[PDB]
Design a protein around this nucleic acid. Structure first.
Lengths: 130, 219, 130, 130
RNA sequence: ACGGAAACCUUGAUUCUAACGCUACUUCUAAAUAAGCGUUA
């Protein structure tokens, strides 16, 4: 049983980012600067999955996972004496780590990178800031 | 006496290069100034149009003897080498530039890089308000090398001009070394060097021993 | 009920382009360069739909939807101290997303691609810029 | 009221062609290469209208209208520091866009195609270059 | 049991040879990832 399939990842990203925490004014707490490194690493992993075999990209996925955990744990936004952690909220509401656990070949890796594409696309669609 | 001589070199960057392209292969979450890339490999490239245009503009300040308002108003020694659409004599030039592609990706990997393009963060600081406005610019990695190929053709129109065209090619490459390949090079971008610069007669019969001596000695 | 039919899509593009946001000078805010990638993807999808079945075109359609929702939020123009989203305005007024959701077979996919062609044709007919 | 009938479309093409704008040298700003695709599509539609019923020709008429407006909005010539749209002018003075909306059967379609042929004949008769 | 009967306007023929949608053109121009440390103790 996989959480990401070719028939649901775009709608999954839709629902995942429509549930992200918002300020009292309605703006998203997440910004593109907080996830810029993760997006760059996902883009590079997608680029390198086309040429090289999956066994060569065994350290890149692990680096991507440790980057996801580090960024989710370190990014904090404080408004109105309340501190939220938008990257961790995005990771748990998008099931990023669980999807990363189901990466075992080129197909699943490319599906995950397309899922991240969809996540940031729809984040920008609903008023996400740079 | 038709012949073709291939000047082959390694364009090794001394600084990050930003030749700059469109958003056709840009990332889906990147507020960047993307560089021109190969459609398949998504690797940075040095287009031959950039090299030809920059070299032609640089050689226009040394080999014209008259300021030119257009590439068509260029001198004969440069029109016969780069081409001239308003001159039946020089409508097809003797120089073919080629797109340069990354040729040391393995060495860069062994050096410990995660991607072949980095993102440099700059800003402009307001001098009245001390307000900083940031930008991100994509660049190719500093120690990248690109295969450079330049084909020079020799016909009967090159009866007593090859030794001058060779000198112009050397001067153009040298001027490119004391300049920057296309980008924000006024802030320290696009410094390049030509390594293992050698000329090989790939077609016909021609002697390139002396030319190769000034290539590998004068550079 | 389907919003794109063989009898109404050209008139639908006619009605949608006329309602796009304009400056006080009367010219449009959307440019062709903002929708260049979307037009290229639609053209490639339409070309490739002729030779192959819709079963393995699902990734291309999902990526097309992802790129539409991304370019809607990415492209913003600031004019007269007011931010505008021209691609988002075009997508919301031409019902691009709802027409994409109706794509289930080759006929609907080609109808959507022809509708996009009609939209850009009428945008250029009304003085739209590159 | 039908603008194109079997008795005046040739004269309409004649007056339209006489009303087309020219250069300072008296040369036609419109060229046949600007309308080559439109003429090819008109010829194919006329050829297909003889055998196939108008039910399957509606998509072809819609695409023909889309091509007409796209070429009206796309082709522009800048001469003497002034820009002009030769295809748009030809469409306006020849009264083509709303002559397309009255195409409801085979007879109206063939009337429009013969009108386009007359427009081309009288455009070439008055010095229209290729 | 008719100015009538019998009779192929027929055979053989490539709308073919030659021709680069080509020449010229830098995705370019300026821009420190930087500023502010109050008040209480």
């Amino acid at each position: 049983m996989a959480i990401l399939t070719d028939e649901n990842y775009v709608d999954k990203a839709e629902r995942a980012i429509s549930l992200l925490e918002k300020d009292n004014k309605g703006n998203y707490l997440l910004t593109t600067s907080q996830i810029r490194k993760l997006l760059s690493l996902c883009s590079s992993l997608y680029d390198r999955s086309k040429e090289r075999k999956f066994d060569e990209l065994i350290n890149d996925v692990s680096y991507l996972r440790v980057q996801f955990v580090y960024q989710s744990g370190r990014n904090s936004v404080r408004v109105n004496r309340q501190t939220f952690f938008p990257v961790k909220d995005l990771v748990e509401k998008g099931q990023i780590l669980e999807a990363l656990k189901e990466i075992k070949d080129r197909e699943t890796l490319q599906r995950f990178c397309r899922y991240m594409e969809a996540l940031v696309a729809y984040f920008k669609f609903y008023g996400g800031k740079d | 006496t038709f012949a073709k001589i291939k000047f082959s070199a390694q364009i090794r960057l001394e600084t990050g290069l930003h030749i700059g392209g469109s958003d056709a292969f840009a990332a889906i979450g990147a507020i960047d100034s993307p560089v021109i890339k190969d459609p398949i490999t998504n690797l940075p490239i040095i287009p031959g149009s950039s090299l030809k245009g920059k070299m032609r503009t640089l050689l226009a300040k040394v080999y014209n003897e008259k300021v030119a308002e257009k590439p068509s108003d260029d001198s004969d020694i440069l029109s016969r080498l780069f081409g001239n659409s308003k001159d039946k004599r020089f409508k097809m030039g003797r120089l073919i530039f080629r797109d340069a592609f990354l040729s040391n990706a393995d060495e860069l990997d062994s050096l410990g890089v995660r991607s072949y393009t980095e993102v440099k963060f700059e800003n402009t600081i307001d001098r009245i308000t001390a307000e900083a406005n940031p930008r991100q610019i994509e660049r190719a990695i500093r120690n990248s090398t690109f295969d450079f190929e330049l084909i020079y053709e020799i016909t009967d129109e090159n009866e007593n001009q090859v030794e001058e065209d060779f000198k112009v090619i050397r001067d153009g490459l040298k001027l490119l070394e004391l300049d920057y390949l296309g980008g924000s090079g006024s802030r320290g971008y696009g410094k390049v060097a030509f390594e293992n610069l050698k000329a090989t007669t790939v077609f016909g019969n021609y002697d390139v021993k002396t030319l190769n001596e000034l290539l590998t000695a004068e550079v």
